[PDB]
Amino acid sequence: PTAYALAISSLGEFNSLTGGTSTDPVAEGNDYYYRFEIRAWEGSSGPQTNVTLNVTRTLGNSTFAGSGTKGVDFEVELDPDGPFGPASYAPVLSADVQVLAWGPTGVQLRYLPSLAPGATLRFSLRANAVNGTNTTVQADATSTEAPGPYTVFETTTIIP
């Protein structure tokens, strides 16, 4: 059988850490936010542990912003019933996220609680728009139990 599975999705760029409106292109000198989801398979043989997002800049000049402050530079939200129920995304406790790395060209965030089958996490990441070269970021999802990584690339058009 398939014991455990995870998935990743890009949701594109937004003008706010939470809520707000979509964006892209972005004018150089403005902040913007990437969002990614990590999604636990509903058929998983149990909760998944060490669910980790690794995002690296692959092309262009934009930078992950700030020092790594939850609620300013990044946010992790949990939808405990995923798409399968009406519960909405809500920010998780600060203690529930370990910032493994936070720098201008790479960020790594680990969810410390276990992630129930079907549940999803939404990661929002603040960035500084820089260039008229596009910025492309690589986002990798892994967990202990799932045969990761699962990778996407999202691209932002920067106006000089």
Q: Considering only the stretches 42-50, 67-75, 77-85, 143-151, report the one whose residues sit in contact with Ca ion under the rule CB under 5 A.
A: 77-85
Burial of 142 (0-12, 13-18, 19+ CB in 10 A): buried
Q: Which of 28, 77, 81, 96 binds Ca ion (CB under 5 A)?
A: 81
Select the residue interacting with Ca ion from 87, 93, 112, 159 (CB under 5 A). Answer: 87
Largest Cα–Cα distance in the chain? 51
Q: Is 79 labeled as ligand-binding?
A: yes
CB 52 within 8 A of CB 143: yes
Residue 85 or residue 132: which is nearer to Ca ion going by CB?
85
The torsion defined by the Cα of 136, 120, 70 and 126, in degrees rounded to 10, comes to 20
* Distance separating alpha carbons of residues 16 and 42, to the nearest angstrom: 30
Give the total of residues touching Ca ion (CB under 5 A).
Answer: 6
Interacting span for Ca ion (CB under 5 A) from 40-48, 61-69, 82-90, 93-101: 82-90
Residue 79 touches Ca ion, criterion: CB under 5 A: yes
Give me the residues that bind Ca ion (CB under 5 A), please.
Answer: 12, 24, 79, 81, 85, 87
